[PDB]
Structure formats: structure tokens, C-alpha cells
């Protein structure tokens, strides 16, 4: 279909979260991009699937829930039913994908995106396969409580250029960030 894409925004300090929210002021072009990648499908007829954790689902305003133009999928080991507005519940990343394969998720599912969080990016990586890491490098410190799982990066390729990805350092709201994409076929 599509390959395990991971999409994360990192602060220099390796922070991704802080009290169920973002280590930084919301940055709208970074949001538009995020929207861009995860929704956008070439196969016709098919949606992308975004796999996300309990605390990530919840950070996202009710208002944009479930994310417009993507099958929303939630990972929790505690709810019984999936959070409202949210399309599936899956106790673990191995079954999230089994489901894809399952009967109706089959013809529909085009790519699958890992929006996070921590143990989800944690399950991801540690998979043998075609994984591309879409990394947004917020080039500032923000005190955060939740962090990026570190990637043995001698095992990834840093593509200099990616299809539709800005390659020069971007500056919104006095903040400065840059996009890099990583690969691995292990
Ligand atoms: N800035 C960015 O790019 C990103 C920021 N964020 C932010 O970072 C923080 C997210 O907090 P974090 O603790 O990472 O929480 P997550 O939202 O990733 O947690 C999802 C919940 O789901 C469960 N879960 C997670 N991984 C798995 C798994 N592999 N199998 C089953 N259940 C799983 C855990 O809950 P249970 O007890 O249900 O198992 C966890 O509580 C918030 O600040 C959020 O806004 C998140 C993603 C990207
Ligand atoms: N790289 C990258 N990777 C990630 N995994 C990632 N994860 C998060 C996780 N926490 C959230 C919180 C909110 C939303 C959300 O709300 N989602 C909308 C975006 C619409 C844009 N909304 C705006 O910011 C906005 C608001 C008003 C006017 C203009 C805009 C705009 O985007 O220009 C959508 O459809 O995807 C998503 C994730 C945050 N940042 C990330 N960055």
C-alpha cells in the first residue's frame, strides 16, 4: 500500500509534549503541512489511516475530531470502546495493521501515518520494513515532560530532498524549524 510513515515535530531538546499538549505555541504552517501529508492520497477511492495514542487524540480539539479526510485510529489499553468521533480502537500496533489487512480496511486503506505518541513511535521503528520518518525540527528549547524515543540513526538515510518537502529552514512566529525525512529498509 503505503509505507509506515512516522510524522513527529521535535524541539531541539527532543520534546514532543507537555501536559497533554504541545511543547510550543501552535505553529500554523507546520499544522497545514501536517494536514498535507497525512490526508493527501494519490490512490483514488482510498483514505490514509493515522494511528494515534490516547493522549494525542485528546490534545486535538474536539472540533477537528475525527481528523478530516483520514481514517482515525486510536490505541489504548484502557478504554473499552473507542473514544467518540474516533473510528477504531486497537489495543496494540501489531493489531492496528492486522485490521488494515482485515476485510473492509483492505480496499480503502492507502497509507498509514504514525502521528504518535511515544510508545507508538516506540512500537513503529522496531519493525523490519519500509519506514520513513517525517521529522519536523523545532530549533529551540521548550520545557516538555514527553520526549522523542531516540532512533539509532546510523540505521537511517537522511534524504537530502523529499517530494514536497521544504528543504530550507522555515520561520513562523519568531520560531525557526526545518523538515528532514529519514529512511530505513531493515
Ligand atoms: N508535537 C508532536 O509532533 C506530537 C506531539 N504529541 C503530544 O505529546 C504528548 C503525547 O503524550 P504521550 O504520553 O506520548 O501519549 P500518547 O498520546 O502517544 O498515548 C496514547 C495513549 O495510548 C496508549 N498507547 C500508546 N502507545 C500504545 C501502544 N503501542 N499500544 C497500546 N496503547 C498505546 C497509552 O495509553 P493506554 O493507557 O490507553 O494504553 C498512551 O496513553 C502530548 O503532549 C501530545 O500533544 C503527540 C504526538 C506528536
Ligand atoms: N509534524 C508534526 N507531526 C505530528 N505528529 C504532530 N502531531 C501533533 C499532535 N498534536 C496535535 C494537535 C492538533 C492537531 C490538529 O488539530 N490537526 C489538524 C491540523 C489543522 C491545522 N490547524 C491550524 O493550526 C490552523 C488554525 C487556524 C488557522 C490556520 C491553521 C493552519 O493550519 O494554517 C489536521 O487536520 O491535521 C494535530 C496534532 C502536533 N503537531 C505535529 N506536527
PDB file of C-alpha atoms and ligand atoms in Angstrom:
ATOM      1  CA  UNK A   1       0.000   0.000   0.000  1.00  0.00           C
ATOM      2  CA  UNK A   2       1.867   2.884   1.512  1.00  0.00           C
ATOM      3  CA  UNK A   3       4.830   2.524   3.876  1.00  0.00           C
ATOM      4  CA  UNK A   4       4.942   3.070   7.637  1.00  0.00           C
ATOM      5  CA  UNK A   5       5.374   6.768   7.666  1.00  0.00           C
ATOM      6  CA  UNK A   6       6.077   8.375  11.067  1.00  0.00           C
ATOM      7  CA  UNK A   7       5.326  12.157  11.469  1.00  0.00           C
ATOM      8  CA  UNK A   8       6.654  13.868  14.597  1.00  0.00           C
ATOM      9  CA  UNK A   9       7.612  17.518  15.475  1.00  0.00           C
ATOM     10  CA  UNK A  10      10.674  17.739  17.709  1.00  0.00           C
ATOM     11  CA  UNK A  11      12.112  20.525  19.785  1.00  0.00           C
ATOM     12  CA  UNK A  12      15.919  20.624  19.977  1.00  0.00           C
ATOM     13  CA  UNK A  13      15.566  19.162  23.481  1.00  0.00           C
ATOM     14  CA  UNK A  14      13.791  16.143  21.909  1.00  0.00           C
ATOM     15  CA  UNK A  15      10.414  17.217  23.397  1.00  0.00           C
ATOM     16  CA  UNK A  16       7.112  16.408  21.666  1.00  0.00           C
ATOM     17  CA  UNK A  17       4.714  17.040  24.555  1.00  0.00           C
ATOM     18  CA  UNK A  18       3.964  18.721  27.815  1.00  0.00           C
ATOM     19  CA  UNK A  19       0.784  18.336  29.977  1.00  0.00           C
ATOM     20  CA  UNK A  20      -1.314  16.793  27.219  1.00  0.00           C
ATOM     21  CA  UNK A  21      -0.245  19.465  24.780  1.00  0.00           C
ATOM     22  CA  UNK A  22       2.494  20.904  22.635  1.00  0.00           C
ATOM     23  CA  UNK A  23       5.846  21.943  23.916  1.00  0.00           C
ATOM     24  CA  UNK A  24       5.315  25.102  21.744  1.00  0.00           C
ATOM     25  CA  UNK A  25       2.780  27.698  20.629  1.00  0.00           C
ATOM     26  CA  UNK A  26       0.715  26.141  17.841  1.00  0.00           C
ATOM     27  CA  UNK A  27       2.603  26.952  14.516  1.00  0.00           C
ATOM     28  CA  UNK A  28       0.063  27.090  11.703  1.00  0.00           C
ATOM     29  CA  UNK A  29       2.204  26.375   8.615  1.00  0.00           C
ATOM     30  CA  UNK A  30       3.588  23.372  10.495  1.00  0.00           C
ATOM     31  CA  UNK A  31      -0.087  22.297  11.060  1.00  0.00           C
ATOM     32  CA  UNK A  32      -1.005  22.855   7.376  1.00  0.00           C
ATOM     33  CA  UNK A  33       1.903  20.633   6.414  1.00  0.00           C
ATOM     34  CA  UNK A  34       0.981  18.075   8.982  1.00  0.00           C
ATOM     35  CA  UNK A  35      -2.519  18.208   7.495  1.00  0.00           C
ATOM     36  CA  UNK A  36      -0.920  17.977   3.972  1.00  0.00           C
ATOM     37  CA  UNK A  37       0.977  14.775   4.308  1.00  0.00           C
ATOM     38  CA  UNK A  38      -1.403  12.672   6.333  1.00  0.00           C
ATOM     39  CA  UNK A  39      -4.558  13.435   4.301  1.00  0.00           C
ATOM     40  CA  UNK A  40      -3.176  13.608   0.761  1.00  0.00           C
ATOM     41  CA  UNK A  41      -3.817  10.428  -1.241  1.00  0.00           C
ATOM     42  CA  UNK A  42      -2.958   9.536  -4.836  1.00  0.00           C
ATOM     43  CA  UNK A  43      -4.787   6.218  -4.936  1.00  0.00           C
ATOM     44  CA  UNK A  44      -8.401   7.141  -5.765  1.00  0.00           C
ATOM     45  CA  UNK A  45     -11.045   5.857  -3.590  1.00  0.00           C
ATOM     46  CA  UNK A  46      -8.759   5.369  -0.635  1.00  0.00           C
ATOM     47  CA  UNK A  47      -8.087   7.296   2.568  1.00  0.00           C
ATOM     48  CA  UNK A  48      -4.953   7.319   4.656  1.00  0.00           C
ATOM     49  CA  UNK A  49      -5.087   5.887   8.162  1.00  0.00           C
ATOM     50  CA  UNK A  50      -3.430   7.916  11.029  1.00  0.00           C
ATOM     51  CA  UNK A  51      -2.602   5.710  14.096  1.00  0.00           C
ATOM     52  CA  UNK A  52      -2.549   7.711  17.334  1.00  0.00           C
ATOM     53  CA  UNK A  53      -2.425   7.151  21.150  1.00  0.00           C
ATOM     54  CA  UNK A  54      -4.984   8.047  23.907  1.00  0.00           C
ATOM     55  CA  UNK A  55      -3.200  11.260  24.968  1.00  0.00           C
ATOM     56  CA  UNK A  56      -2.718  12.535  21.303  1.00  0.00           C
ATOM     57  CA  UNK A  57      -6.327  12.043  20.352  1.00  0.00           C
ATOM     58  CA  UNK A  58      -7.285  14.264  23.331  1.00  0.00           C
ATOM     59  CA  UNK A  59      -4.815  17.226  22.570  1.00  0.00           C
ATOM     60  CA  UNK A  60      -6.572  17.648  19.253  1.00  0.00           C
ATOM     61  CA  UNK A  61      -9.621  19.986  19.715  1.00  0.00           C
ATOM     62  CA  UNK A  62     -12.994  18.169  19.679  1.00  0.00           C
ATOM     63  CA  UNK A  63     -13.816  20.444  16.741  1.00  0.00           C
ATOM     64  CA  UNK A  64     -11.307  18.768  14.410  1.00  0.00           C
ATOM     65  CA  UNK A  65     -12.137  15.298  15.706  1.00  0.00           C
ATOM     66  CA  UNK A  66     -12.048  12.939  13.868  1.00  0.00           C
ATOM     67  CA  UNK A  67      -9.400  14.446  11.657  1.00  0.00           C
ATOM     68  CA  UNK A  68     -10.989  15.495   8.312  1.00  0.00           C
ATOM     69  CA  UNK A  69     -10.017  13.070   5.414  1.00  0.00           C
ATOM     70  CA  UNK A  70      -8.155  10.213   7.156  1.00  0.00           C
ATOM     71  CA  UNK A  71      -9.445   7.085   8.986  1.00  0.00           C
ATOM     72  CA  UNK A  72      -8.768   7.936  12.684  1.00  0.00           C
ATOM     73  CA  UNK A  73      -7.300   5.093  14.711  1.00  0.00           C
ATOM     74  CA  UNK A  74      -6.822   5.043  18.491  1.00  0.00           C
ATOM     75  CA  UNK A  75      -4.523   2.963  20.645  1.00  0.00           C
ATOM     76  CA  UNK A  76      -5.352   2.480  24.242  1.00  0.00           C
ATOM     77  CA  UNK A  77      -5.066  -0.395  26.615  1.00  0.00           C
ATOM     78  CA  UNK A  78      -7.804   1.042  28.916  1.00  0.00           C
ATOM     79  CA  UNK A  79     -10.957   2.258  27.119  1.00  0.00           C
ATOM     80  CA  UNK A  80     -13.435  -0.480  26.106  1.00  0.00           C
ATOM     81  CA  UNK A  81     -14.998   1.285  23.185  1.00  0.00           C
ATOM     82  CA  UNK A  82     -13.019   3.821  21.066  1.00  0.00           C
ATOM     83  CA  UNK A  83     -13.218   7.473  22.002  1.00  0.00           C
ATOM     84  CA  UNK A  84     -16.212   9.233  20.384  1.00  0.00           C
ATOM     85  CA  UNK A  85     -15.827  10.618  16.814  1.00  0.00           C
ATOM     86  CA  UNK A  86     -12.761   8.333  16.501  1.00  0.00           C
ATOM     87  CA  UNK A  87     -13.265   5.283  14.037  1.00  0.00           C
ATOM     88  CA  UNK A  88     -11.273   2.392  15.622  1.00  0.00           C
ATOM     89  CA  UNK A  89      -9.723   1.229  18.751  1.00  0.00           C
ATOM     90  CA  UNK A  90      -6.797  -1.096  18.754  1.00  0.00           C
ATOM     91  CA  UNK A  91      -5.049  -2.376  21.845  1.00  0.00           C
ATOM     92  CA  UNK A  92      -1.651  -2.572  20.051  1.00  0.00           C
ATOM     93  CA  UNK A  93       0.257  -1.674  16.868  1.00  0.00           C
ATOM     94  CA  UNK A  94       0.544  -5.284  15.770  1.00  0.00           C
ATOM     95  CA  UNK A  95      -3.336  -5.434  15.538  1.00  0.00           C
ATOM     96  CA  UNK A  96      -3.740  -1.908  14.204  1.00  0.00           C
ATOM     97  CA  UNK A  97      -2.077  -3.235  10.997  1.00  0.00           C
ATOM     98  CA  UNK A  98      -3.840  -6.678  11.076  1.00  0.00           C
ATOM     99  CA  UNK A  99      -7.034  -4.674  10.901  1.00  0.00           C
ATOM    100  CA  UNK A 100      -5.786  -2.804   7.808  1.00  0.00           C
ATOM    101  CA  UNK A 101      -5.402  -6.189   6.260  1.00  0.00           C
ATOM    102  CA  UNK A 102      -8.863  -7.187   7.621  1.00  0.00           C
ATOM    103  CA  UNK A 103     -11.791  -7.262   5.242  1.00  0.00           C
ATOM    104  CA  UNK A 104     -13.045  -3.809   4.820  1.00  0.00           C
ATOM    105  CA  UNK A 105      -9.871  -1.933   5.761  1.00  0.00           C
ATOM    106  CA  UNK A 106      -8.347  -3.619   2.707  1.00  0.00           C
ATOM    107  CA  UNK A 107      -9.609  -1.784  -0.405  1.00  0.00           C
ATOM    108  CA  UNK A 108      -9.860   1.536   1.430  1.00  0.00           C
ATOM    109  CA  UNK A 109      -6.538   1.902   3.280  1.00  0.00           C
ATOM    110  CA  UNK A 110      -3.890   3.752   1.233  1.00  0.00           C
ATOM    111  CA  UNK A 111      -1.007   4.845   3.679  1.00  0.00           C
ATOM    112  CA  UNK A 112      -0.624   4.678   7.119  1.00  0.00           C
ATOM    113  CA  UNK A 113       0.704   7.530   9.237  1.00  0.00           C
ATOM    114  CA  UNK A 114       2.123   7.478  12.766  1.00  0.00           C
ATOM    115  CA  UNK A 115       1.256  10.761  14.322  1.00  0.00           C
ATOM    116  CA  UNK A 116       2.400   9.327  17.696  1.00  0.00           C
ATOM    117  CA  UNK A 117       2.986   9.485  20.629  1.00  0.00           C
ATOM    118  CA  UNK A 118       5.869   7.895  22.433  1.00  0.00           C
ATOM    119  CA  UNK A 119       5.296   4.219  22.690  1.00  0.00           C
ATOM    120  CA  UNK A 120       3.586   4.305  19.256  1.00  0.00           C
ATOM    121  CA  UNK A 121       6.716   5.805  17.740  1.00  0.00           C
ATOM    122  CA  UNK A 122       8.281   3.217  20.089  1.00  0.00           C
ATOM    123  CA  UNK A 123       6.356   0.260  18.525  1.00  0.00           C
ATOM    124  CA  UNK A 124       6.909   1.579  14.881  1.00  0.00           C
ATOM    125  CA  UNK A 125      10.645   1.806  14.372  1.00  0.00           C
ATOM    126  CA  UNK A 126      11.277  -1.543  15.936  1.00  0.00           C
ATOM    127  CA  UNK A 127       9.547  -3.058  12.851  1.00  0.00           C
ATOM    128  CA  UNK A 128      11.571  -4.659   9.942  1.00  0.00           C
ATOM    129  CA  UNK A 129      10.469  -2.637   6.974  1.00  0.00           C
ATOM    130  CA  UNK A 130       9.954   0.358   4.846  1.00  0.00           C
ATOM    131  CA  UNK A 131       9.852   3.199   7.272  1.00  0.00           C
ATOM    132  CA  UNK A 132      10.186   6.827   6.504  1.00  0.00           C
ATOM    133  CA  UNK A 133      10.462   9.282   9.355  1.00  0.00           C
ATOM    134  CA  UNK A 134       8.987  12.656   8.635  1.00  0.00           C
ATOM    135  CA  UNK A 135      10.817  14.798  11.142  1.00  0.00           C
ATOM    136  CA  UNK A 136       9.923  18.480  11.948  1.00  0.00           C
ATOM    137  CA  UNK A 137      12.937  20.052  13.811  1.00  0.00           C
ATOM    138  CA  UNK A 138      11.840  22.883  16.001  1.00  0.00           C
ATOM    139  CA  UNK A 139      15.224  24.536  16.574  1.00  0.00           C
ATOM    140  CA  UNK A 140      14.512  25.877  20.058  1.00  0.00           C
ATOM    141  CA  UNK A 141      14.086  24.514  23.591  1.00  0.00           C
ATOM    142  CA  UNK A 142      10.700  24.188  25.193  1.00  0.00           C
ATOM    143  CA  UNK A 143      10.390  22.532  28.644  1.00  0.00           C
ATOM    144  CA  UNK A 144       8.475  19.300  27.896  1.00  0.00           C
ATOM    145  CA  UNK A 145       7.560  16.228  30.004  1.00  0.00           C
ATOM    146  CA  UNK A 146       7.160  13.839  26.985  1.00  0.00           C
ATOM    147  CA  UNK A 147      10.033  13.147  24.581  1.00  0.00           C
ATOM    148  CA  UNK A 148      11.024  11.533  21.300  1.00  0.00           C
ATOM    149  CA  UNK A 149      12.166   7.883  21.628  1.00  0.00           C
ATOM    150  CA  UNK A 150      15.794   8.029  20.319  1.00  0.00           C
ATOM    151  CA  UNK A 151      16.456   6.293  16.976  1.00  0.00           C
ATOM    152  CA  UNK A 152      19.780   4.532  16.426  1.00  0.00           C
ATOM    153  CA  UNK A 153      20.294   6.828  13.435  1.00  0.00           C
ATOM    154  CA  UNK A 154      23.238   5.093  11.777  1.00  0.00           C
ATOM    155  CA  UNK A 155      20.416   2.877  10.578  1.00  0.00           C
ATOM    156  CA  UNK A 156      18.587   5.563   8.593  1.00  0.00           C
ATOM    157  CA  UNK A 157      19.212   7.509   5.462  1.00  0.00           C
ATOM    158  CA  UNK A 158      18.731  11.312   5.508  1.00  0.00           C
ATOM    159  CA  UNK A 159      17.257  12.030   2.102  1.00  0.00           C
ATOM    160  CA  UNK A 160      18.575  15.490   1.162  1.00  0.00           C
ATOM    161  CA  UNK A 161      15.344  16.283  -0.601  1.00  0.00           C
ATOM    162  CA  UNK A 162      11.847  14.722  -0.345  1.00  0.00           C
ATOM    163  CA  UNK A 163       8.948  15.107  -2.735  1.00  0.00           C
ATOM    164  CA  UNK A 164       7.150  18.174  -1.386  1.00  0.00           C
ATOM    165  CA  UNK A 165       9.033  18.860   1.405  1.00  0.00           C
ATOM    166  CA  UNK A 166      10.560  22.227   2.126  1.00  0.00           C
ATOM    167  CA  UNK A 167      14.302  21.744   2.396  1.00  0.00           C
ATOM    168  CA  UNK A 168      15.255  25.180   3.846  1.00  0.00           C
ATOM    169  CA  UNK A 169      14.765  26.359   7.458  1.00  0.00           C
ATOM    170  CA  UNK A 170      11.279  27.927   7.965  1.00  0.00           C
ATOM    171  CA  UNK A 171      10.414  30.746  10.455  1.00  0.00           C
ATOM    172  CA  UNK A 172       6.990  31.199  11.854  1.00  0.00           C
ATOM    173  CA  UNK A 173       6.033  33.272  14.849  1.00  0.00           C
ATOM    174  CA  UNK A 174       9.634  34.120  15.652  1.00  0.00           C
ATOM    175  CA  UNK A 175      10.206  30.299  15.909  1.00  0.00           C
ATOM    176  CA  UNK A 176      12.538  28.596  13.361  1.00  0.00           C
ATOM    177  CA  UNK A 177      12.020  24.983  12.194  1.00  0.00           C
ATOM    178  CA  UNK A 178      13.262  22.661   9.454  1.00  0.00           C
ATOM    179  CA  UNK A 179      11.983  19.436   7.862  1.00  0.00           C
ATOM    180  CA  UNK A 180      14.222  16.358   7.346  1.00  0.00           C
ATOM    181  CA  UNK A 181      12.970  12.870   6.207  1.00  0.00           C
ATOM    182  CA  UNK A 182      14.645   9.600   7.305  1.00  0.00           C
ATOM    183  CA  UNK A 183      14.523   6.182   5.776  1.00  0.00           C
ATOM    184  CA  UNK A 184      15.256   2.689   6.585  1.00  0.00           C
ATOM    185  CA  UNK A 185      14.665  -0.603   4.917  1.00  0.00           C
ATOM    186  CA  UNK A 186      15.842  -3.048   7.572  1.00  0.00           C
TER     187      UNK A 186
HETATM  188  N1  LIG B   1       4.497  17.637  18.728  1.00  0.00           N
HETATM  189  C1  LIG B   1       4.282  16.484  18.009  1.00  0.00           C
HETATM  190  O1  LIG B   1       4.698  16.279  16.909  1.00  0.00           O
HETATM  191  C2  LIG B   1       3.490  15.413  18.690  1.00  0.00           C
HETATM  192  C3  LIG B   1       3.074  15.776  19.918  1.00  0.00           C
HETATM  193  N2  LIG B   1       2.302  14.882  20.714  1.00  0.00           N
HETATM  194  C4  LIG B   1       1.971  15.398  22.130  1.00  0.00           C
HETATM  195  O2  LIG B   1       2.934  14.716  23.030  1.00  0.00           O
HETATM  196  C5  LIG B   1       2.142  14.197  24.188  1.00  0.00           C
HETATM  197  C6  LIG B   1       1.614  12.796  23.982  1.00  0.00           C
HETATM  198  O3  LIG B   1       1.791  12.165  25.251  1.00  0.00           O
HETATM  199  P1  LIG B   1       2.255  10.581  25.251  1.00  0.00           P
HETATM  200  O4  LIG B   1       2.349  10.103  26.632  1.00  0.00           O
HETATM  201  O5  LIG B   1       3.230  10.439  24.258  1.00  0.00           O
HETATM  202  O6  LIG B   1       0.852   9.890  24.804  1.00  0.00           O
HETATM  203  P2  LIG B   1       0.201   9.212  23.513  1.00  0.00           P
HETATM  204  O7  LIG B   1      -0.914  10.134  23.219  1.00  0.00           O
HETATM  205  O8  LIG B   1       1.094   8.779  22.489  1.00  0.00           O
HETATM  206  O9  LIG B   1      -0.506   7.980  24.355  1.00  0.00           O
HETATM  207  C7  LIG B   1      -1.618   7.268  23.668  1.00  0.00           C
HETATM  208  C8  LIG B   1      -2.154   6.510  24.911  1.00  0.00           C
HETATM  209  O10 LIG B   1      -2.344   5.456  24.324  1.00  0.00           O
HETATM  210  C9  LIG B   1      -1.727   4.241  24.802  1.00  0.00           C
HETATM  211  N3  LIG B   1      -0.691   3.810  23.886  1.00  0.00           N
HETATM  212  C10 LIG B   1       0.403   4.460  23.435  1.00  0.00           C
HETATM  213  N4  LIG B   1       1.172   3.675  22.719  1.00  0.00           N
HETATM  214  C11 LIG B   1       0.399   2.436  22.776  1.00  0.00           C
HETATM  215  C12 LIG B   1       0.619   1.026  22.167  1.00  0.00           C
HETATM  216  N5  LIG B   1       1.721   0.827  21.458  1.00  0.00           N
HETATM  217  N6  LIG B   1      -0.333   0.082  22.412  1.00  0.00           N
HETATM  218  C13 LIG B   1      -1.380   0.490  23.162  1.00  0.00           C
HETATM  219  N7  LIG B   1      -1.666   1.645  23.721  1.00  0.00           N
HETATM  220  C14 LIG B   1      -0.707   2.582  23.473  1.00  0.00           C
HETATM  221  C15 LIG B   1      -1.149   4.715  26.128  1.00  0.00           C
HETATM  222  O11 LIG B   1      -2.346   4.653  26.823  1.00  0.00           O
HETATM  223  P3  LIG B   1      -3.295   3.325  27.457  1.00  0.00           P
HETATM  224  O12 LIG B   1      -3.042   3.522  28.876  1.00  0.00           O
HETATM  225  O13 LIG B   1      -4.549   3.640  26.762  1.00  0.00           O
HETATM  226  O14 LIG B   1      -2.534   2.209  26.772  1.00  0.00           O
HETATM  227  C16 LIG B   1      -0.982   6.233  25.971  1.00  0.00           C
HETATM  228  O15 LIG B   1      -1.562   6.752  26.928  1.00  0.00           O
HETATM  229  C17 LIG B   1       1.019  15.293  24.296  1.00  0.00           C
HETATM  230  O16 LIG B   1       1.744  16.495  24.740  1.00  0.00           O
HETATM  231  C18 LIG B   1       0.623  15.317  22.784  1.00  0.00           C
HETATM  232  O17 LIG B   1       0.137  16.586  22.496  1.00  0.00           O
HETATM  233  C19 LIG B   1       1.954  13.628  20.249  1.00  0.00           C
HETATM  234  C20 LIG B   1       2.348  13.255  19.035  1.00  0.00           C
HETATM  235  C21 LIG B   1       3.149  14.061  18.051  1.00  0.00           C
HETATM  236  N1  LIG B   2       4.863  17.220  12.166  1.00  0.00           N
HETATM  237  C1  LIG B   2       4.005  17.029  13.137  1.00  0.00           C
HETATM  238  N2  LIG B   2       3.740  15.796  13.381  1.00  0.00           N
HETATM  239  C2  LIG B   2       2.897  15.408  14.285  1.00  0.00           C
HETATM  240  N3  LIG B   2       2.532  14.163  14.625  1.00  0.00           N
HETATM  241  C3  LIG B   2       2.262  16.364  15.070  1.00  0.00           C
HETATM  242  N4  LIG B   2       1.438  15.872  15.984  1.00  0.00           N
HETATM  243  C4  LIG B   2       0.853  16.796  16.711  1.00  0.00           C
HETATM  244  C5  LIG B   2      -0.073  16.201  17.802  1.00  0.00           C
HETATM  245  N5  LIG B   2      -0.995  17.093  18.468  1.00  0.00           N
HETATM  246  C6  LIG B   2      -1.917  17.622  17.550  1.00  0.00           C
HETATM  247  C7  LIG B   2      -2.784  18.658  17.873  1.00  0.00           C
HETATM  248  C8  LIG B   2      -3.687  19.142  16.890  1.00  0.00           C
HETATM  249  C9  LIG B   2      -3.787  18.569  15.610  1.00  0.00           C
HETATM  250  C10 LIG B   2      -4.753  19.113  14.629  1.00  0.00           C
HETATM  251  O1  LIG B   2      -5.526  19.962  15.107  1.00  0.00           O
HETATM  252  N6  LIG B   2      -4.907  18.835  13.349  1.00  0.00           N
HETATM  253  C11 LIG B   2      -5.374  19.322  12.055  1.00  0.00           C
HETATM  254  C12 LIG B   2      -4.379  20.351  11.536  1.00  0.00           C
HETATM  255  C13 LIG B   2      -5.108  21.519  11.030  1.00  0.00           C
HETATM  256  C14 LIG B   2      -4.257  22.689  11.200  1.00  0.00           C
HETATM  257  N7  LIG B   2      -4.883  23.821  12.161  1.00  0.00           N
HETATM  258  C15 LIG B   2      -4.210  25.079  12.474  1.00  0.00           C
HETATM  259  O2  LIG B   2      -3.139  25.059  13.121  1.00  0.00           O
HETATM  260  C16 LIG B   2      -4.758  26.408  11.998  1.00  0.00           C
HETATM  261  C17 LIG B   2      -5.664  27.136  12.782  1.00  0.00           C
HETATM  262  C18 LIG B   2      -6.216  28.350  12.324  1.00  0.00           C
HETATM  263  C19 LIG B   2      -5.907  28.881  11.133  1.00  0.00           C
HETATM  264  C20 LIG B   2      -4.992  28.197  10.322  1.00  0.00           C
HETATM  265  C21 LIG B   2      -4.449  26.964  10.747  1.00  0.00           C
HETATM  266  C22 LIG B   2      -3.457  26.327   9.787  1.00  0.00           C
HETATM  267  O3  LIG B   2      -3.212  25.116   9.844  1.00  0.00           O
HETATM  268  O4  LIG B   2      -2.901  27.296   8.975  1.00  0.00           O
HETATM  269  C23 LIG B   2      -5.403  18.419  10.816  1.00  0.00           C
HETATM  270  O5  LIG B   2      -6.391  18.412  10.053  1.00  0.00           O
HETATM  271  O6  LIG B   2      -4.377  17.761  10.717  1.00  0.00           O
HETATM  272  C24 LIG B   2      -2.927  17.526  15.346  1.00  0.00           C
HETATM  273  C25 LIG B   2      -1.993  17.048  16.267  1.00  0.00           C
HETATM  274  C26 LIG B   2       1.135  18.134  16.524  1.00  0.00           C
HETATM  275  N8  LIG B   2       1.961  18.595  15.585  1.00  0.00           N
HETATM  276  C27 LIG B   2       2.551  17.712  14.842  1.00  0.00           C
HETATM  277  N9  LIG B   2       3.447  18.032  13.841  1.00  0.00           N
END
